[PDB]
Design a protein around this ligand. Sequence first.
Ligand SMILES: Cc1ccc(N(C)C(=O)c2ccc3c(c2)N(C2CC2)[C@H](C)C(=O)N3C)cc1
Length: 123
Amino acid sequence: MNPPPPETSNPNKPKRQTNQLQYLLRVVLKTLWKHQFAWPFQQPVDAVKLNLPDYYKIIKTPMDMGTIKKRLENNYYWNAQECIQDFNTMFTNCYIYNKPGDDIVLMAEALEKLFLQKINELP
Ligand SMILES: Cc1ccc(N(C)C(=O)c2ccc3c(c2)N(C2CC2)[C@H](C)C(=O)N3C)cc1
């Protein structure tokens, strides 16, 4: 079974649209989104489709770029650090569940290097 996806809307939450959060959506996420290796990370891991019933027994804080994109489009975050933390959870989950040298890890490593290049300087 797949768990419910992470929440992307929360009215009880203080929201903000800072210059950096706009940049994280308009330039950072949407550059990463078009990368040739982005597709595994554009939605939650479908453990049912992959027949990996073990994935959510190991990864207890799932995150993906589809969730992040929705959060940004809902002004879910208070600051850019919260959004950057979600990206880093996504990469770290991949490094936890898989092993160095695995194909999915090469993909995440390529995406993470681009991510770090783009957030090195924020508005
Ligand atoms: C090289 C590769 C890439 C994509 C897939 N396909 C079809 C996925 O749907 C998929 C999406 C996301 C992940 C994964 C598969 N893998 C599994 C491959 C170990 C683990 C759970 C993971 O960490 N992520 C992020 C299969 C192989």
